[PDB]
Amino acid sequence: LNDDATFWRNARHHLVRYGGTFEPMIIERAKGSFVYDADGRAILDFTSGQMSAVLGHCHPEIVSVIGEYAGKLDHLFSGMLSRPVVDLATRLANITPPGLDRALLLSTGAESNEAAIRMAKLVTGKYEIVGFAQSWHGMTGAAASATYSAGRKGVGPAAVGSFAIPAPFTYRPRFERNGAYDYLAELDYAFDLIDRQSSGNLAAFIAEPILSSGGIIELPDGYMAALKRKCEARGMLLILDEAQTGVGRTGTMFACQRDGVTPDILTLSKTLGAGLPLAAIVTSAAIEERAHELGYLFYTTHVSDPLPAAVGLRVLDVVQRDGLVARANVMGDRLRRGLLDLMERFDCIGDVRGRGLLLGVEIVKDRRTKEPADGLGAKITRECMNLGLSMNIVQLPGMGGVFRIAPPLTVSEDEIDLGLSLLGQAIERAL
Amino acid sequence: LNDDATFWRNARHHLVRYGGTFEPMIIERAKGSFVYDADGRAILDFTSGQMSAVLGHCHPEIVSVIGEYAGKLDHLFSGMLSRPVVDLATRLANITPPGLDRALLLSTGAESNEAAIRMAKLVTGKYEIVGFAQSWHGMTGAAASATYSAGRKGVGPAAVGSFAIPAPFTYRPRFERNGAYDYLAELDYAFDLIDRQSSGNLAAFIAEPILSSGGIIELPDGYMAALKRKCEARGMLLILDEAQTGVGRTGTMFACQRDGVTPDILTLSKTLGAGLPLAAIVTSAAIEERAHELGYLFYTTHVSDPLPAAVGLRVLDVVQRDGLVARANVMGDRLRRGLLDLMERFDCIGDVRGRGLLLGVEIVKDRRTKEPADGLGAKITRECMNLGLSMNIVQLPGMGGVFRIAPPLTVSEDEIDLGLSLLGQAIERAL
Amino acid sequence: LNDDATFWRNARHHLVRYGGTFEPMIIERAKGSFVYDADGRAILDFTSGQMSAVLGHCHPEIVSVIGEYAGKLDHLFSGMLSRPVVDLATRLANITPPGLDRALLLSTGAESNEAAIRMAKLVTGKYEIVGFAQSWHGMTGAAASATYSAGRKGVGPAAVGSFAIPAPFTYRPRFERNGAYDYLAELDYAFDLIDRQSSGNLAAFIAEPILSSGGIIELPDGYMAALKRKCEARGMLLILDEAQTGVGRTGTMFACQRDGVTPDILTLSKTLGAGLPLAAIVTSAAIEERAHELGYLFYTTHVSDPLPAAVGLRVLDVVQRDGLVARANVMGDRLRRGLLDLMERFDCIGDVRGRGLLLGVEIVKDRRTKEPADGLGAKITRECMNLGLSMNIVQLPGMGGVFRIAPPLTVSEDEIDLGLSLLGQAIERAL
Amino acid sequence: LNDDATFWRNARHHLVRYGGTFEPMIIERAKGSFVYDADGRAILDFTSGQMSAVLGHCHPEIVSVIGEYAGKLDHLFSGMLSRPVVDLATRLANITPPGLDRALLLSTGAESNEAAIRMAKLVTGKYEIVGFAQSWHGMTGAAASATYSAGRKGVGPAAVGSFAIPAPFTYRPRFERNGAYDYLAELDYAFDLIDRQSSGNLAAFIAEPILSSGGIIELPDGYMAALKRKCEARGMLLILDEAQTGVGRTGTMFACQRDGVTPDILTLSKTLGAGLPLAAIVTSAAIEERAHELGYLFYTTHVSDPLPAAVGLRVLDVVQRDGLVARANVMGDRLRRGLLDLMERFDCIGDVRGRGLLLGVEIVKDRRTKEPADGLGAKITRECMNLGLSMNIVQLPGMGGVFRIAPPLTVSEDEIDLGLSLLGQAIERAL
């Protein structure tokens, strides 16, 4: 049973609470798109853990490579190169757009964003960073100052020079020009303000292609292109954080590929490691040269370590080989149509957005008022769990709670169906 | 051969340079206290990689546990608990001093320090952080603002509220009271200044027990106790960063155990993971309760993940079981005596400091003037490498270059001897 | 002649240039609404010097009081009270709205704003200050961090916690709701953003009732009331800077009186001194009590000095006695109608705004496109000067150059007429 | 009587308390070295008001010039030059050392320091400012961030980039080298620390020649020269704040003249105005040229106003003409010898320091322990007042209360004697 008294004793006495509330189960094993409790019950992981497990739990190839490497090459002094590091770096250069040539292999998303932000400050000589008011870039330092989706309060002043602009949100537009939501005019309006407060030290803009923590908000068409134009005019670098979108999840290898705008620096993390801690930054040779001439430094205990790199390489090989990016469109299409059907059934479903296998469902009081449903989300989540479907909801000020759906790229048709089915039942049970 | 043209091509074209300069070898395999090149040459890892590999490379127990877990339980949603997480947290509570009860399991040293700094700000309501002028806490954000050993220049303003005090350095004392280096009077002098610049928001003091990046500088006797007293008087938390000293390296499970001063928050990392990315913070129940009531939040992709936790547990079991902490004193004694003998032979060796198996050798022009040797260090390092001994030197302003020695806790007598031997030969060759 | 070689030599060699460019005349004497050059030429001061001389130059009453006091009571130790200080403080309490009871007598506008900002931080315990993107509060410190109309660039980071919102500008509206410029919706939009970046330390909002440096921009109807509501909801103080509007200039003793919103702190300066350096803050007893309990401190060399206070009192007596506030409406009406007529004549005149005797004339390429006229303003100004009419233009990004008109409250009908006449001639000459 | 009920009513109801506590008298008239109460009682102003009245109260020449100008030329638009401004600027260039050529005429000490700090940031491109831990530069903005003698607490974070070093204090030395207070070694020690925390943006160092608010602490011999050397090596400007020392008070026209070190920027204020608000910055032509090319801007309502400038000129003429700088040495010698005699009489007098007519008397429990006398100072001050001698004491952490003595430069022998006499009586009465 999940009701182990010692287990729970020990958990209450010795774990630091870090947000949220522990599920009341003891996970004992994981495989593919499911996690199992102590009773053996199978729970469908519709979030890929913490949005990372792109190939599902314990994929045999990964299992196999972790294996080879753990007994052969594990961790090395930062100045020592090995084959997996060089192969992964090369691989990343080749599959990202032209213009992205050089990589730095790290451990976490926050490290990746820091490394990027540091390079951009060095290279430009400036220090002001601009991000979205609904961003999520990580909890450590700079990444944290650039994070506006949560954690700003009660912890003292943020980094000097941090500005934020509102992110384009089509579902609840707030900026109108001639009777229509004009998101590009909004962009212009936001930049003008920035321009007014800057001390003349704009160094970069950090953005997510699809704001995940922010409520699965997709930057609309033409946005990115205009964004990049705003940056160019001001001599700012554009850093794209693809922690959640990279590695096939939205139907393209990288989300930037859809828009056709290649950033100055690209950061990857969650999905690169497929569950393990691996992260990276990819930049142009020009930028790297300059940062080097300038004395750029970024040391971490695990930069360029063999084991993690080996793993990331294997992840890319699988994704490529098995056509997982394509699968993401097909499965994503399947899931999306099902969610639409749900929306036909229940008025509480106010919106279904996202791309590929990175979908959001905004729950609302009523489809016309678009009033956020107070407490329903949590019911729904609860019931899901009872029904065996792992979900994650996010609630932001001014918005209805949002379900972040993001199954493994290896998810099967049946699992998509099962999930859709349990989701329906949970909602019906919750009203 | 290490001279693979494709390999090197690819490395020059696709890797971001992050400090230092890549060794010109291709590491192909690692085992115990040695790494091997493409030619099969065995190099004695006297740094344990990046000071992490406490049990050496590819230790079979570790290999075996990485194994069990990679195929059973890998990565989970942050709100789901598992046995390895709870067991590791419990274990950490039990082997750290009384007063340290609750743990947070993360991935890196910088994350660990951030998590700690954030809690301390929350809990105290203040935001000013004090650290040493020679500290190393990591590159991301807050950790970085608290880091004074390197990376402060060219990257824009540091975090608001950062102060630094000089660290007690017995080898090159600079504060005298009545004819003697009075490090406690120095402490008083430093705090007075702080007190003058503070805005009245002192929240914490972050320190390393033995400054690693700073040149293997050990806080002298009675220092820590006075430090903690300074903090108490000002309502500040004392955070101890044991990334390099924790887990048996200096001859005690934790360095704080030698002094008998238990910190408010303890952070661990390099040696906990033994080469993998695992880190953690350990605090008192009181502090945790408060941070919780206050709404403390710290999310990371890999917080509480099963695999890494499993590994850390196995590391502790080995260290305990095999009496590695004791071994550290015995081997450490062996290495230290050898280094002293070298110092008998060569006048360039100005000091031999450190504890257990965390030793520093300061190279100087001349033993009396204590003038830093300009360029000798690098020669020596070069020769070492040629001789098959992996070393790492650090050079700080105003000090002679320092060799950081830190072999695996599983290092054998022979390896200690071999190392001592190659070191002698390299120095003789370098003059 | 104004062409004194020694004079000009000395000026080029020994004066620090601080912005702008010195007029090429030597002012020798000033009287009423005119200044005279070395040739004796009379120039009509349509700016009241630097918008301060509310009673004109060298008003006999002022002359007379400066006189009595300079030989009787001049400057005293900060802790010594005198009658003029107490009488001025009392007077200010009585003529400002209910709710404003206690005053602090200083020397400059920037000091006044600093004193206010400091009190607001003390009293609230918070530190974030919000201001307008087109504000002007002074050059020293906090006032400067709150100043967004100019001087942000090239001088290093601004004060931590500074935010700015766009100011309502009816002439060039940019925020639309349902086909109309909705300035209150803009306000809501701006605050939401603030709310997102704040660290939870909003202490105050500083605003001008009529943005002077910003281009003579009047806060529209209902704005101030909504502003104050925004502040109340967030526990923020509302500080009103009436340096240019206070003391009768816009037709009410204080501009806040028109809207009926009384601020938490009111600051006065330019017009209080009528040309001399006198400034002040007026707050409620409650706020003062609290700041006192909290240990509020604000020392300046000239706080509570007799001479300046004596002068300010005399200024208020004159304004009251001679009905200068009323006169401001009558004369203001006269000037405004004339400016409108000009606007009938010349298409370059795009807007005539302002209140009382604080008027702005925005010069534009063309009345429909509203394109800013590039260089015309300067011509016009030049010609004015030649014609004997002292003017001042301001040019802000995105706006047409703006003429700041602001004659003495003692200005006569003839002088208004003369001015209108020279202005017409200069424009005709400039096209 | 001083017991006017209405007066006191009005003062309690309408004045903002800004530090300290109002003396319980009503000052009605002032003349020379005395102020008079409502009862006509003459009080000997041994502080020159707030250390400003260098020529005493209501000096006839000043009275006479305030007169001429108030009715002729009062306040003008910032871009209009007049003779008093140019004459004062020229005068300042001529009487300050070679290297100081260009002046900016303002209103207050804080404005002066801001203007200076802004220029130094512009010209160097950097932003970090260094000052003394016991400094006093004013309350507004930058000046305030550089002020460490008081007001740092409870008002939010200081300006980014502010550092402070300890000031050399011979009476209570704390840094020893080879058995002696080595203040230059202290300087080296302090800079090293700075160097460690800087982000590489050191722009200037701001110092007072004799720390006034800090307890009348004189920078010892050779200090300034070493200071300036420290700055040069780091490409930093050295700004000297002579608000209290300038204009003859310490026996030289400017204190910098004694040491022979000419600063990059010199600021003046209290004594320049002799009681009125006049201030100024004096810099080299090179620095001014550069700041101009860079777009330096510094606008204030009263920059370059005629009246105040006229006054400052007259002050310099008097000081020069009447040989007041010399008188300061003679009178200063008289006062100092008397204070020494007191020190012979009473063990509570621990030190007599200062120069010219800027003297400090540190009261202590006991001459050997040097323990600060708790409460005696206040008694003494109280008695003085009763005896008719206006005094001012300052109390800093770790020091005995200090009496700031600073009579007018026009003080007579008799007044010096009287003062010495009342001081003795008050101390005798206080024990």
Ligand SMILES: *Cc1c(COP(=O)(O)O)cnc(C)c1O
């Ligand atoms: C998760 C995430 C990060 C940070 O990754 P961590 O491993 O949590 O440090 C950064 N950006 C985005 C968009 C993320 O989703």
Ligand SMILES: *Cc1c(COP(=O)(O)O)cnc(C)c1O
């Ligand atoms: C290495 C180190 C850290 C940071 O660990 P990373 O894995 O590099 O983020 C923090 N503190 C000390 C003392 C360290 O040695």
Ligand SMILES: *Cc1c(COP(=O)(O)O)cnc(C)c1O
């Ligand atoms: C002029 C002005 C100030 C500052 O006054 P100074 O005397 O220049 O310091 C502040 N606010 C407003 C609105 C001003 O017009």
Ligand SMILES: *Cc1c(COP(=O)(O)O)cnc(C)c1O
């Ligand atoms: C008084 C003083 C100032 C500031 O002058 P204010 O008129 O108070 O603004 C600056 N520096 C020193 C050394 C002072 O004594």
Ligand SMILES: [Li+]
């Ligand atoms: Li490594």
Ligand SMILES: [Li+]
């Ligand atoms: Li997890």
Ligand SMILES: [Li+]
């Ligand atoms: Li005064």
Ligand SMILES: [Li+]
């Ligand atoms: Li003027």
Ligand code: NA
């Ligand atoms: Na590429």
Ligand code: NA
């Ligand atoms: Na413990």
Ligand code: NA
């Ligand atoms: Na009132």
Ligand code: NA
């Ligand atoms: Na000079």
